[PDB]
Structures are given as C-alpha cells and as structure tokens.
Enzyme design. Structure first.
Site, PDB file in Angstrom:
ATOM      1  N   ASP C 330     -37.051  71.437 -59.187  1.00  0.00           N
ATOM      2  CA  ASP C 330     -38.400  71.937 -58.967  1.00  0.00           C
ATOM      3  C   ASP C 330     -38.369  73.463 -58.903  1.00  0.00           C
ATOM      4  O   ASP C 330     -37.351  74.100 -59.182  1.00  0.00           O
ATOM      5  CB  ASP C 330     -38.991  71.328 -57.700  1.00  0.00           C
ATOM      6  CG  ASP C 330     -39.119  69.824 -57.783  1.00  0.00           C
ATOM      7  OD1 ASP C 330     -38.838  69.263 -58.862  1.00  0.00           O
ATOM      8  OD2 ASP C 330     -39.499  69.203 -56.769  1.00  0.00           O
ATOM      9  N   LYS C 441     -59.927  71.252 -58.090  1.00  0.00           N
ATOM     10  CA  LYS C 441     -59.376  72.601 -58.224  1.00  0.00           C
ATOM     11  C   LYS C 441     -60.353  73.663 -57.721  1.00  0.00           C
ATOM     12  O   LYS C 441     -60.473  74.746 -58.298  1.00  0.00           O
ATOM     13  CB  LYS C 441     -58.957  72.890 -59.667  1.00  0.00           C
ATOM     14  CG  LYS C 441     -58.013  71.860 -60.262  1.00  0.00           C
ATOM     15  CD  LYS C 441     -56.732  71.750 -59.454  1.00  0.00           C
ATOM     16  CE  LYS C 441     -55.696  70.910 -60.181  1.00  0.00           C
ATOM     17  NZ  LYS C 441     -56.300  69.690 -60.783  1.00  0.00           N
ATOM     18  N   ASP C 671     -38.308  65.487 -52.528  1.00  0.00           N
ATOM     19  CA  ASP C 671     -39.474  66.014 -51.816  1.00  0.00           C
ATOM     20  C   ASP C 671     -40.768  65.384 -52.342  1.00  0.00           C
ATOM     21  O   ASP C 671     -41.624  66.036 -52.943  1.00  0.00           O
ATOM     22  CB  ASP C 671     -39.528  67.545 -51.904  1.00  0.00           C
ATOM     23  CG  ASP C 671     -40.701  68.137 -51.143  1.00  0.00           C
ATOM     24  OD1 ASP C 671     -41.250  67.448 -50.259  1.00  0.00           O
ATOM     25  OD2 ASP C 671     -41.077  69.292 -51.434  1.00  0.00           O
ATOM     26  N   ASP C 675     -41.467  61.059 -56.528  1.00  0.00           N
ATOM     27  CA  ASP C 675     -40.152  61.372 -57.068  1.00  0.00           C
ATOM     28  C   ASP C 675     -39.123  60.285 -56.797  1.00  0.00           C
ATOM     29  O   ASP C 675     -37.992  60.397 -57.281  1.00  0.00           O
ATOM     30  CB  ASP C 675     -39.651  62.695 -56.487  1.00  0.00           C
ATOM     31  CG  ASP C 675     -40.675  63.799 -56.594  1.00  0.00           C
ATOM     32  OD1 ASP C 675     -41.339  63.888 -57.644  1.00  0.00           O
ATOM     33  OD2 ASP C 675     -40.828  64.570 -55.626  1.00  0.00           O
TER      34      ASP C 675
END
Ligand code: NA
Lengths: 296, 250, 929
Positions: C330, C441, C671, C675
């Site tokens: 990441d 957003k 994290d 994932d």
C-alpha cells in the site's frame, strides 16, 4: 557562528551556534562520538548540498564534550568526573544560556547515549532524536573482558578506530580510515581524550522498555526517533537492541546500505534524505519537496 | 554419473589437495622427530618396573606342548632357541670385554661396553650341550628373561625363583645358580648406546619323569630378591611375574 | 446446552447484570468481577508434565541403541562376576560410561528444545488481543483478558468479538459465524428478537467470531469457558530436504557400522567389543541434533525479526520470507508516514505556501480578504476533528488531534493561521453534517451564518477537486462571486496538476449561500429528500498537504532494487499523485518513463508510443477491472516498475494472482477486512500491527509492529540468512564423522595400534554436538546479502555434492590428521617412533607377548602398552574436541613440546585455509575453508 563556551556544574562545555534562532523553532543540537569533535564529523555533513535547505530553516548548535574542543589544556590527574548521566546533566544549562526552548537531537555513539539520557531525564525539552550508532547497554561480560585484555596492549587511537569502523574496512584500511586517524591522533588533546573514553566505558545501562500495555513499564523516549546504523558497522546489534525496548510507533530503524562506521560522512546523501523526511513527518519544512522528485 | 572430464577434474583436485595436506603432515612429523632425542626416550614414567617373559613363545598363548617321540613337535622350540642363543655362544662375544661381578657397571662418555654372558651359565640348557634343548630326553628347557629398561638400577640381590605349582612333584631345576641374575649387566643404556648388550638369562628345566608323564606343570617365575623390581600387581600378571605350562605328550 | 439472554428486554438487562446501558459498570466493579469471576475465556488447554518430554528425549531416537549397549555391558559384567571371582571391573565401567553418555546427550537435547520453545511463545504477548469497552464513561482499550461479565463492549468492522455478547445497539453490523457454523456468509446482528434458538437469534454475538462490517455494542453474558465456543473442544521444503538428507546419512551410518562390525570380528574382537563398536559408530555417524539445529536457527532468526518490528506468526513464514520476489504494498502508513501537514494552497490564482509556523505566520499573505476568510471558515467548519482535553498548553505543532490524518492536518494548519478553531466553530452554529464515505466524495454540512445573511442554511462542503468543481459552478475571486469560464477551469486544472505533481493530497472547497425564498428559516433537512441544492456552488480555493515518505523507505526501496525484488505500489490515489510519490520513494526511479512520459518528451501523442519502450507503468484501478488475465499478465511481465492507482482493495487479490502466475513469491499488505482474501492467497501475507484490524492480523503470516515498509525489507534480508546458515550448521555437524572412522581404517590398513576406541569415539561425538547450535547463537550477518538475486524455492537445495564433499573430505581430513598427529607424538615421546609402529598392531594387541620392543631397545609388558594406548585415545578425543571448539571462536573472529595438542591441528587448519584462499576456486566454497 558564535562560539559561546558556557561553564556549569562539572565543567566548561564549548558550543558553536552556526545559525540564528528562528523564534522558538527547535534548534538542531549535535553531539559527537569518542575520538573526535564536531568539526571532524558534523562539519562534513552539515556542509552537504542537500543539507543546506534543512539548515536554512533551522539553527545548528554544535556542542563539544568537555576537553575535546580544539585547542584545549590538560590536567595532571584530570579525574574527568562527568559520567553519562552527568554529561547529560549540563545540557539544560547550555539550553538556558543560549535562550533555547526545544532541540532536535544529533547523536553519534557517546553523543547518542548522552542525548538519549537527556531526553529521558527531561522529555519536554527534546522534540526528536536521530541517534546514530547508539548503544543502550554497558560493555557486558565477554566484551568487557576482551576490552580489558586487548586494549591494554593496544593504542587508544587504534581502539577508537576499532570502535568506529568495521573489521572489514579496518583490515582493508582504505583512504577514509587514514584520513580520519589523522584527525583523531591530532586535533585532539589525548590527556582528556583517554579520560572521556574511560568515562564512556564506565556507563550504566540505559533504562528503556518497549511498552507492552500491561502501568509498571519502564519509561521510554516519547519523542520521535530515527536510529541510523550502517549495514557494515560494529554497532549493529547495539542499535537493533536499542530499536527493541523502544516504542515502535515513534522510532524508525534505518539500516543504511553500502555503508559502515560513520553514516554521516560516508553516505550523507541518504542520511540527509532520511533526516528531511523525519523532520517533515514531525511537521517542519512542509514545502521542501521530495529529493528523488526534485530533479524533474 | 558419466561426466568423465568432471570426474577427472574432481580426482585431480583431490589429488593435489591431499598431496598438500600430506606434505604439511609430513613436515610437521619431521619437525616432531627432530626435537626427539634418539638415544633415550623423552619420558620413562610409563615403564617403571621390568616385566618377565619366557622364550620361545608358544603358538597357543603360553602353552608349551611337545611330544616325547615326535622330533617335529619340539622342533620349533628347538630352532627358536638356537636362533636366540646364537649371539650368546662364545664365538661371538669374544670381542666383548670381561666384567667384574656384583656391582653396577655404570659407564660414562662414549665407551659404553657390555659385559659378556657365558652361555655355559645355563648348564644343561645351553646349546653347546646336546643339540636338543632338553627335549628328546625328558627335561624341557625354557628360558626366563627379564625386560630391558634404560637406566634401570635394581637394588639388593636380584633373583628369579621358579617354583612349580603342581605340588612340586615335578620339581623345577632353575639352572643359572639358584636363578641368580648377575647385577653386573643391569645399568642398561639402550641400543646405539649399548652395543652388543646381551641381557642376562635364566634357564628353567622341568623334571618330566616317565612315571608322571603327560599332565601339565604350572611353573610360576617371579623376581624375589630386589625391592626395586615390583612383583605384585592387581592388573599386570607379567610385572615381575610369569606363569607357563608344559605338557609332555607320551 | 444453549441458554441465553436473548429473551430478556433492555430494561431488565440493567437489573440482571447491574450495568448502565450507556455508561457501563465502573472500573471498581470490573476489578471485583475479575477477581471473583476470573480472566476472560482463555480456553484452558491441556499440557504435558514435561517429565514425559525429558524421558522421551532420554529414551527416544537412537539413544535406545546406547541403552541396549549399556544393558549388554552390565549383563556381561554380572555374569562374569557370578561365574568367576576377582572380576575385572571393565564391562561395568563401560556400561556406566555409556549410560552417562545417554544422559548427557538427553540433557543437551532437552535444553535445546526448552530454549527453542521458550524463545517461541514470547510472540503471543507482542500483539495481545484487545477489547473496546466504554467503562467509566470513555471508550477505553483494556486487554481482552480483562473483560468481565456485564460491561458493554463495542465492536467495529474487522474486530473479533471479545466474549459472548447480546448487542443492544447496531449500525449495520454483520458477523462471520464460520467459526461456529459451516457458512462464511456475513449474517447480520440487530437488537431485535429473531428465532428463539440462540444460534440464529440475530441478537447474540458469539465468542471468537469476527465483525466484518458495521458497528455494534452489547452486554457481555458469558466470559470464560462458559462461552458457546468454549464448551466445545503439511511440510516445508527446508524440512523435506533435511529429512531426506538425514535418512540418507542414517543409511550410510548403518552401512558403515555393519562393515566396521564385520571387520572388527575379522580382527579377533570380543563379541561385546564388536557389538559395542558397531553401536558406537552407528550412534556417532547419524545426525541427531540436526532437527534441533534447524529449529534453533529458525527460532533465533524469528526472534531477530521480532526485534526489528517484524513479528512472524509461524516458522514456515520465516523460510518463505527469505525467498520473496514481489512486495506489492500500500502507500498510506506503509510507504508514507501518514502524518500529513498542509503545505500549499491555491486561491486568487496564486499558488500560496502554507509554511506559516512561528516565524512570519502570514507566509506570502497575512490576512488577504473574504477569499481566505471563507477558505478558513470552510476548513474549520467542515472538519469532524477536535483537540482532546488536557492539551491546551503544548504548542500547536506538538499537539494531538483525534480523527482522520487529513482532518488533523487541516485543523492544525488553519488553527495556526487563524486563532482558536474551537471558538471559530462555536461562534457559528453546526446543525447538520452528512457522514463521510467513498461514494459521494463530498462532506455536506448545513450551517447558519450569524454575520449578515443569516440564511439558516449553508453549503460548506469539501471533496476531490475533479468532482467538486463539477458541481460548484460559480467561483470566488477577490471576494466577489464570478462565473466560471473555460479560462478559470484551465487555470484550476493547471493548479491541480502542479500541486498533485509534487506528491501532495489536494482537496477542494466550494460553498454557496442558499436563497431564503426557496427554503425559509424553518426547514427540515432530510437525506432522502433533495432539499438543499447539492449543485451550483461557488469555488473558493484549493488546499494541498504533504504526506512525506517514511524515513527508511527510500533506502529499503533501493535495497529491493539491488536485491532483485519487484516492488508494486497499490494505492487508491490519483494517478498523478501516485506517480509523483512513487518517483519520490524510488518505485519508478530515474530514466525509466511511463508511456505518457515518453509521449510528452517526444511530443508525440500517447497512442503511437511503443509500449515496450516504457519500463514504468501506472495502471488505473477502473482500467484493471477490464483487463483479462492475459493483459494483466503482460502488464506485470513487461513492466518492471508498476504502480496501481485508484485500485480498490478487492483488486489486490487479482494483482496477487497475476504476480503469482509467473512463479514469484508475493508478499502483500493487510490493514483491512477486504484485504483478507489477498493475505490468504499470497505466499507471505503481511498485516499491520497498529493500523491493521483483527481480521487482517488473523489472516496474515507476518505482522509489522511499526507499520513501516522498510521492516518488510529488513525481514526479507533476515530470512535470507537462514539459507546459508543452515548449510554451515550441516557442514559443522558433518565434519566430525571422519576423525571418528579414519582411526579404525588406518588401524586396519597400516597395522598400527588403535588411535581411537569406541568409548573415546562416543566422547568425541558427545563433545562436538553443540558446535552448530553455539555457532548459530554467536553469528554475524554476512555482507552483500541483499545484492544477490532471490533464491529459487524449487531449483535450489541446501545439500549438494560441493557441501557434502566440503564437510567430509577436507575439514574432516584436516581434523583427522590433527588427531593422528596428537596420537603419533605421544607414542613417539614414550619410545615408539612413528616408523616403528607400522606392522606393530598384531604384537601390540597380543596379550601373551610381553616383550614388545621400543625403538630404544626397551621391552614393554602388555598392560604397560595399553596404558600408553589409552593415553593416546584420550589425547585423540581431547585434541579433536578442543580443535573443533577453538576453530569456531577463531573463524568467528577472523572472518615444552605438548604443542602437539590443539596448537597443531589449528595451525594446519589455518595453513590449509591460506592455501584454499590462494586458490580462489569457482560459486565459492571457500568460506567453509
Ligand atoms: Na556426526
């Protein structure tokens, strides 16, 4: 450029402020290792091209260990009373005399130990440490025995290079090694140099523990830390043991590659980048851009 | 796995490597021998007292077995004794000097001469007598010599007394005096420093009369006169002692 | 057995457990219950008394052969004593010595096993499980073991349930009941009353399950073994190679033992002596302390990783870390510090600098006008972060904030610029604010201006510049609202490209004062209803913040570059910002260009640029959703420096599969709960110690205690060392076999007195079986370890003909020659010169020949020869052991006439080392000397 030589408590400490205090912005305080002063090590680092931008926005407060300053007298018996706790004790007087509020550590070997002890004693004054080649433990048993059996029949300067550089470079004995034994044999008063080395050997184990979430834990450096050590340096296990027994949230381990002995004079281009990112993560010089992105 | 060239390279590498290793070992061995003196051993603490041995050595673990009538059964003992006693005859020790009796013949410098042992001191067991060393007659002859030690100086009067354990009915006649070892030979100085040294011998003849033929004796010889020469040990049955058995077939 | 409190009601839950549903029981009551009820679940497991373990170490393995030999010796001594008087106490001594050897070797094995298992199990408290309780009024983070029955516990997305819970409030929470059930489907949980069976009541959160999404809070009902889950209840390549090698050497040892037994019987040996010599050779030529040696090496390395902030969760991941070939990672928290600070702002067409700080707090602008006034107002009223209490004295740069890193950075910047952000937000009135999500957003808030307008509604909102501009049609210049033309749009795009090109997060801020006619003072704003005019706002300015790379990250990237490891950045950031940060850390490097970069440099349009001319690529996340397997394979194969921008965490699994289809050993970053499939699919999946969630730590094979990417590189380097430490240990445990069998061979061949007896052989083996373990304990890292290409897991073997020959024909031969020298010298100094010993075996071994002659003419009784022979045997053993131990401390450092002791064999070892240093040979089996 000022060279105030403040005297306090167990001696006279000579500092060389190479800058102007930017209000209450922390001033970079530099402590050298055994066998050398600030000129030999840190004047070859703070003069680097990339290090100029950091020093422009900060101030440099090069400090010298008592007796290791250039052009210093001696004492027939000496009795260099300042120990590691005591050598860290006279730093707050130095800060007060020069109208100082906070500092950022610059520590190499003995200087790293002194700055770590100073931070552990008064955490409010220390903002961060970048301790290079730090040894939080004493000489131990086997290493102490080797020191008291080998150093007796060996020159003090030779043991200084043995402590500084790795065995591979020492056997190779390249240009850097003699370029530095020149400045270690000369430019230093041996009578106080040996006393300072003996005081360095006479150290007590630094009390620090890695927090475990269990109230009874020992104290640790709450300030952000960056542990710099060359991959081919004698003090690799010392720093790794110092990386442990420390808070992983704040401290970083920089095992410098293709380096050894003195990361601040061997690979200054990488140490400067690490220092810039360490300062930017702390909130300073936020518009200094990124080195590998600057050339584009 | 084939690869003849690779096998040849491996063999060549190991050849040169073991040649270098053997050269190092041989040079170290040479340096080891150079520091070693060649007339007397560096250490003597492992041989403090002399053992006892008989002669000839049998083929069955100290078991003297011979036939009364067969000349081949006793043959091997016969020419073994003849070979051993050849330097003891008068024709060879003529060059050897005569020797005073009863005292240590300590020598200094490069003289290092040896006294002579008269072959006739063994009486009937000597080779100058009947060709058969007591065989073909009924009285086998066994030698009992004592081990040589460099720098040995036995104290007192050294003597070997062989007493039969078979109720003494086949009584044992030890020939040289009453088994005396003359003390004039004893300061042995080793080879290359004692040229032509003939160690003293003690001959034992066992009485094998026809009526008590067969059977076996258990002649036990030991040093009984000198305190210097030990005779009792919990592990060594030959330290100042010996014990052999003779069977007279028919 | 399923009785639960799901039938109870909220009001009576205050009486059954005596806890406040919004306050929870006090800390004093918690401590009282902990003292009374006991610790948490803890699932008390069984254990062995460890005396069975010690007895299995003593009597297990090939020590049974030595026990059999000791039994035989004792039996022979007993029968001899019973038959004949005055027995020689030799068989009894031999049996006692054999039993002592067994006991000592069992003690060594037990000590090594205990040390290994005690260095292990120290990783179970490095990251202890945590529970989120709100005891005493604040959401504290007590240890999981301290949770008592009654206190309320809040679980989040990715937090494993600390104990049996009856949730009282839910916010869309779901649980993964695959631990109890067989399905992994995320069943939901709500405080209502579903089926009366507790296993599917939808209001019981079972122990040891994970909350995949949402948030919930509940009262603990079962703590301890009373829980529902508490009531109930193949090989590695290194291990395979070691097992095969051990089996081969054991077969070789058995063959050697049988051959030597037969040859000893041919040489007039007693039955006991032959059956003891066979046992001695077999036990002394089988590698027994080799599994313990590899375990010690792996466990010591895993301890060394944990001290560099790399907690390994297995001993299999230790050996898989050194074979890594791809570190897809990441960007936030791993490759960057995540400590953002505001650096640049763009308003009034000028790209202003946010340097500020103590000196000249008005850098490039002191106060300006309503432009910066509205900018700071939006920055301070759109945030959802506050300074925690007791922090009103420390200076602002050294203050602590709660919330997102970006929000904290904005708070610090505008609170240094303006004054008392707290009074700024309280002077105004904050009424409504929509929650943050990666769907809209924007951060819309409704607000009342008290100065002039007082419209009872405001449109303060912040978001990505490329989208917020699409809705804030107006734009503010010099304090006056103006229409947004194409010129201003082009200027905004240029400012975005300039700020983003520096590797900086850029945020937009647009606001509009709503008319009062459309919405009066009294309005009820609803999320479902359109209500507010979400579009047609007024642009104010742009704010940019730096997220500097971590201090040791560029150096680690350089180390990966030198070590032939491909680093892939998977970031959900803008492609321009991702490219800039990748260039700044070193994942794109110098000279290497993207296709867009080559198009810009050569002034040609992007299309005609040959894709093979660009070695660096930046794949957009939306594009990756459309590549097939072949296209992604081509992307990952032809390009050496890859950046995955705008990539959702779900596509990390696709990236892992693509990188693994080429045979690489992929390491990833966790994290998160999305994932987890990637962490399971990758060869060595890495979680995050601080920022990571419980599920990610559960599904990962390795944990970063400091979140640093450089720690992954350091762990890879540390795991690279085992593949050359293990072969060194194998050579060290193999080199002691030749000084044990060469004595007998030379005895037979050259007809010399025996240089080494059976008990003496066992003493040699016993005294040189801790050398590999001690060498592993005292070892220094090799240089240039991170300058070699990563090892091939399947085409590289620990043991080869160069290593077995190394251990068996050179070092073994050197030590055997040293022992033979120590034998020869002692025989020579007592009278028997070395050249007189050839052919002396028959007489020397004859009990009835007590006139064996020296080289000096002396004559030796049988038991006078055997004393010297026993001295020679003991000297051989001592010399071999104390050259094996001395060469260790001399190799780890440099890289009268009883000199015949260890001083010789060491000297010959140095001499042959110098020779093999002169002959370089060719990789290089010279470091074994
Ligand atoms: Na072995």
């Amino acid at each position: 450029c000022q060279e105030h030589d403040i005297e306090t408590t167990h001696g006279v400490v000579h500092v060389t402020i190479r800058g102007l205090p930017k209000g209450n912005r922390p001033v970079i305080l530099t402590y050298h290792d055994i066998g050398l002063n600030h000129k030999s090590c840190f004047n070859a680092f703070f003069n680097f091209e990339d290090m100029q931008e950091i020093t422009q926005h900060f101030a440099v407060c090069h400090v010298d260990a008592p007796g290791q300053q250039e052009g210093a007298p001696s004492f027939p018996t000496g009795y260099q009373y300042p120990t590691m706790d005591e050598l860290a004790e006279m730093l707050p007087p130095v800060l007060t005399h020069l109208s100082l509020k906070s500092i950022i550590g610059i520590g190499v070997g003995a200087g790293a130990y002194i700055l770590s002890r100073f931070a552990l004693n008064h955490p409010e004054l220390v903002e961060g440490l970048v301790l290079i080649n730090v040894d939080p433990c004493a000489k131990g048993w086997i290493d102490w025995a080797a020191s008291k059996l080998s150093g007796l029949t060996t020159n003090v300067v030779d043991i200084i290079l043995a402590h500084h550089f790795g065995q591979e470079e020492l056997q190779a004995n390249l240009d850097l090694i003699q370029t530095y034994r020149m400045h270690i044999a000369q430019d230093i008063n041996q009578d106080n140099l040996q006393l300072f080395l003996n005081s360095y050997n006479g150290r007590r184990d630094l009390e620090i523990e890695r927090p475990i979430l269990g109230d009874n834990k020992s104290k640790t450096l709450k300030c952000s830390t960056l542990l710099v050590v060359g991959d081919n340096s004698p003090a690799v296990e010392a720093v790794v043991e110092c990386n442990s027994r420390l808070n992983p949230i704040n401290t970083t381990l920089l095992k410098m590659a293709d380096c050894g002995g003195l990361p601040q004079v061997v690979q200054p281009g990488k140490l400067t980048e690490a220092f810039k990112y360490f300062l930017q993560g702390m909130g300073y010089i936020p518009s200094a851009s990124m080195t590998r992105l600057a050339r584009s | 796995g084939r690869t003849a060239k690779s096998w040849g390279l491996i063999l060549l590498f190991y050849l040169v490597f073991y040649g270098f290793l053997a050269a190092l070992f041989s040079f170290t061995m040479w340096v080891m021998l150079q520091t070693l003196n060649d007339e007397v051993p560096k250490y003597r603490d492992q041989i403090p007292s002399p053992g006892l041995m008989v002669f000839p050595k049998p083929v069955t673990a100290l078991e003297y077995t011979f036939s009364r009538s067969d000349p081949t059964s006793y043959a091997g003992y016969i020419e073994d004794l003849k070979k051993f006693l050849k330097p003891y005859t008068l024709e060879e020790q003529k060059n050897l000097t005569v020797c005073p009796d009863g005292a240590l013949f300590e020598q200094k410098g490069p003289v290092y001469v040896a006294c002579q042992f008269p072959i006739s001191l063994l009486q009937a067991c000597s080779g100058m007598n009947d060709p058969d060393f007591g065989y073909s007659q009924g009285n086998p002859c066994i030698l009992v010599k004592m081990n040589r030690i460099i720098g040995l100086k036995p104290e007192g009067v050294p003597r070997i007394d062989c007493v039969s354990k078979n109720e003494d009915i086949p009584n044992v006649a030890v020939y040289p005096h009453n088994g005396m070892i003359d003390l004039k030979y004893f300061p042995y100085y080793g080879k290359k420093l004692h040229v032509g040294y003939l160690q003293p011998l003690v001959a034992v003849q066992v009485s094998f009369a026809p009526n008590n033929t067969g059977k076996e004796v258990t002649v036990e010889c030991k040093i009984d006169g000198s305190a210097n020469l030990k005779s009792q040990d919990d592990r060594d049955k030959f330290l100042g002692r010996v014990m052999f058995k003779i069977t007279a077939r028919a | 057995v399923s009785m639960d409190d799901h039938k109870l009601s909220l009001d009576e839950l205050h009486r059954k457990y005596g806890t406040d549903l919004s306050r929870g029981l006090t800390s004093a009551r918690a401590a009282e219950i902990l003292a009374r009820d006991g610790p948490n679940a803890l699932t008390p497991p069984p254990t062995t008394p460890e005396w069975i373990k010690f007895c299995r170490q003593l009597f297990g393995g090939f020590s049974m052969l030595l026990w059999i030999g000791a039994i035989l010796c004792f039996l022979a001594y007993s029968i001899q004593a019973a038959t004949e008087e005055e027995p020689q106490n030799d068989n009894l001594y031999l049996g006692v010595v054999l039993s002592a050897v067994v006991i000592i070797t069992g003690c060594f094995s037990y000590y090594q096993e205990a040390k290994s298992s005690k260095i292990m199990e120290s990783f179970k408290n490095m990251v202890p499980q945590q529970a989120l309780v709100i005891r005493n009024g604040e959401k504290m983070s007590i240890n999981a073991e301290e949770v008592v029955v009654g206190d309320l516990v809040e679980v989040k997305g990715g937090d494993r349930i600390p104990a049996d819970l009856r949730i009282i409030s839910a916010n869309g929470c779901k649980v993964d009941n695959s631990s109890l059930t067989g399905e992994s489907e995320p069943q939901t949980r709500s405080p209502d009353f579903t089926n009366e069976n507790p296993l599917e009541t939808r209001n019981i959160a079972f122990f040891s399950t994970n909350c995949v999404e949402g948030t919930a809070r509940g009262i603990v009902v079962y703590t301890g073994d009373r829980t529902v889950m508490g009531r109930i209840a193949g090989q590695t390549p290194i291990a395979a190679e070691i097992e095969h090698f051990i089996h081969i050497i054991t077969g070789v040892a058995v063959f050697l033992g049988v051959s030597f037994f037969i040859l000893s019987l041919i040489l007039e040996y007693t039955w006991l002596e032959a059956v003891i010599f066979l046992i001695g050779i077999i036990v002394a030529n089988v590698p027994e302390g080799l599994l313990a040696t590899v375990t010690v090496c792996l466990t010591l390395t895993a301890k060394r990783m944990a001290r560099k902030n790399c907690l390994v969760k297995n001993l299999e991941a230790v050996e898989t870390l050194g074979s890594t070939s791809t570190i897809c990672s990441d960007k936030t928290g791993t490759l960057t510090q995540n400590r953002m600070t505001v650096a640049h702002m763009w308003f009034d067409n000028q790209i202003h600098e946010a340097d500020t700080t103590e000196n000249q707090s008005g850098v490039s602008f002191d106060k300006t006008s309503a432009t910066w006034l509205a900018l700071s107002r939006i920055a301070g009223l759109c945030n959802r972060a506050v300074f925690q209490a007791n922090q009103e004295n420390l200076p602002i740069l050294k203050r602590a904030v709660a919330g997102d890193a970006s929000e904290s950075a904005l708070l610090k910047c505008i609170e240094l610029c303006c004054g008392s952000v707290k009074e700024m937000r309280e002077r105004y009135a904050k009424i409504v604010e929509i929650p943050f999500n990666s769907t809209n957003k924007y951060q819309l808030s409704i607000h009342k201006n008290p100065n002039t307008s007082e419209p009872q509604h405001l449109l303060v909102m912040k978001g990505a510049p490329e989208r917020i501009l699409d809705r804030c049609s107006s734009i503010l210049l010099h304090g006056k609202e103006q229409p947004l033309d194409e010129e201003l749009k082009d200027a905004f795009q240029n400012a975005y490209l300039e700020l983003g090109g520096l590797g900086e997060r850029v945020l937009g801020f647009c606001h509009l004062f709503l008319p009062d006619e459309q919405f009066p003072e009294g309005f009820q704003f609803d999320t479902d209803d359109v209500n507010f005019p979400i579009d047609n706002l007024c642009f104010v300015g742009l704010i940019s913040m730096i997220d500097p790379p971590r201090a040791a990250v560029p150096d680690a990237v350089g180390k990966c570059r030198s070590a032939g490891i491909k680093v892939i950045m998977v970031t959900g950031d803008h492609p321009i910002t991702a490219k800039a940060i990748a260039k700044g850390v070193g994942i794109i490097s110098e000279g290497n260009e993207t296709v867009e970069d080559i198009a810009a440099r050569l002034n040609i349009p992007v299309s005609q640029v040959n894709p093979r001319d660009a070695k660096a690529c930046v794949v957009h996340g939306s594009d990756l959703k459309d590549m097939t397997s072949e296209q992604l394979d081509d992307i990952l194969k032809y390009h050496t420096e890859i950046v995955f921008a705008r990539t959702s965490p779900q596509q990390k699994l696709i990236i892992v599969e693509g990188c693994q289809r080429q045979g690489a050993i992929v390491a990833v970053t966790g994290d998160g709960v999305n994932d987890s499939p990637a962490l399971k699919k990758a060869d060595i999946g890495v979680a995050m110690g601080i920022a990571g969630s419980d599920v990610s730590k559960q599904a990962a094979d390795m944990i970063l205690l400091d979140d640093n990417f450089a720690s992954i590189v350091t762990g890879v380097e540390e795991g690279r060392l085992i593949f050359d430490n293990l072969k060194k240990s194998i050579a060290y445990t193999l080199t002691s076999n030749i000084p044990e069998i060469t004595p007998f061979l030379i005895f037979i061949i050259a007809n010399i007195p025996l240089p080494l007896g059976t008990v003496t052989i066992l003493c040699i083996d016993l005294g040189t079986d801790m050398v590999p373990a001690i060498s592993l304990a005292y070892e220094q890292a090799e240089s240039d370890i991170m300058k070699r290409q990563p090892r091939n897991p399947k085409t590289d073997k620990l043991v080869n003909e160069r290593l077995i020959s190394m251990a068996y024909g050179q070092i073994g031969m050197i030590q055997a020659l040293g022992g033979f020298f120590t034998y020869f010298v002692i025989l020579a100094e007592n009278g028997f010169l070395p050249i007189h010993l050839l052919g002396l075996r028959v007489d020397w071994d004859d009990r009835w020949i007590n006139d064996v002659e020296d080289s000096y003419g002396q004559q030796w009784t049988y038991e006078q020869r055997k004393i010297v022979e026993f001295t020679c045997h003991t000297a051989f053993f001592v010399s071999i052991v104390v050259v094996q131990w001395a060469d260790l401390v001399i190799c780890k450092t440099r890289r009268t006439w009883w000199f015949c002791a260890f001083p010789y064999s060491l000297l010959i070892f140095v001499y042959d080392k110098v020779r093999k240093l002169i002959i370089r040979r060719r990789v290089e089996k010279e470091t074994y000397y």
